[PDB]
Design a protein around this ligand. Sequence first.
Ligand SMILES: [Mg+2]
Ligand SMILES: [Mg+2]
Length: 177
Amino acid sequence: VTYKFHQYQVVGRALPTENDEHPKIYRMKLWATNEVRAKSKFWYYLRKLKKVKKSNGQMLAINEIFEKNPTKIKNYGIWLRYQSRTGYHNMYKEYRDTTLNGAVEQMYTEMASRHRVRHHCIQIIKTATIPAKLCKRESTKQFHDSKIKFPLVFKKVRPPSRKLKTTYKATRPNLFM
RNA sequence: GGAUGCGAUCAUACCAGCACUAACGCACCGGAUCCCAUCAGAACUCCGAAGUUAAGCGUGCUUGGGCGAGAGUAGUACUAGGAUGGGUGACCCCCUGGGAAGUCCUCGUGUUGCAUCCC
Ligand SMILES: [Mg+2]
Ligand SMILES: [Mg+2]
């Protein structure tokens, strides 16, 4: 099981000094492809929001967060702010996936596809597991059906592997739903 | 705890308005023959000790001005380096780093060297 995006809890503080023997300890929940990039973004946010630089700061702890039950489907809501070609905007989106990592990957892909927003232009404000009744988007609410039933409208025809691939076939494919 | 003479730093020491000061001092102060000096014994110079702490000098107060320190402004403005980064462009996001200044708020209003003297 490999996820492109991982969730980390990064803990850090400003370097102790004479004035502050025990400086405030700050924690963040961040998304990054690696722990190194997670720490980089943690220090970026600490510098921008608390005036604590990496040079005069201390790294305390970093742990990965894994989905409790990756075997079941959940509804995930993501509150984010992104930058467009003309300014900044806030955005709330909903996704269905077995893990929040998959939901975040879907969020990045959808932002790229629909708004041409690159990964570095997106800040995640909040994440949460939404119950079915509290979902706001029709896209997620359409699969909240006890008896869900539909045919496979679009299926791509291919051999099990390229071993059986042939340029020529005697008959055209026979497709039906 | 001060004053005076000579200073160091050269406003936390400056400016303005009020109040106060034992002693020695420092002063104000009395004269113009002499040295000296002017329109003017005002100033400067010389000779004094009648009177006064009225002023100067010193100290204290002002929700005072200024001055000095901090907080904040603000990881903002700006900026060194990177990108086959976004954008038509103007410009701008992001990565590796550095990082200010008014307004507003709080505090403080000198510290000292040598010598003589009073207490
Ligand atoms: Mg007097
Ligand atoms: Mg003042």
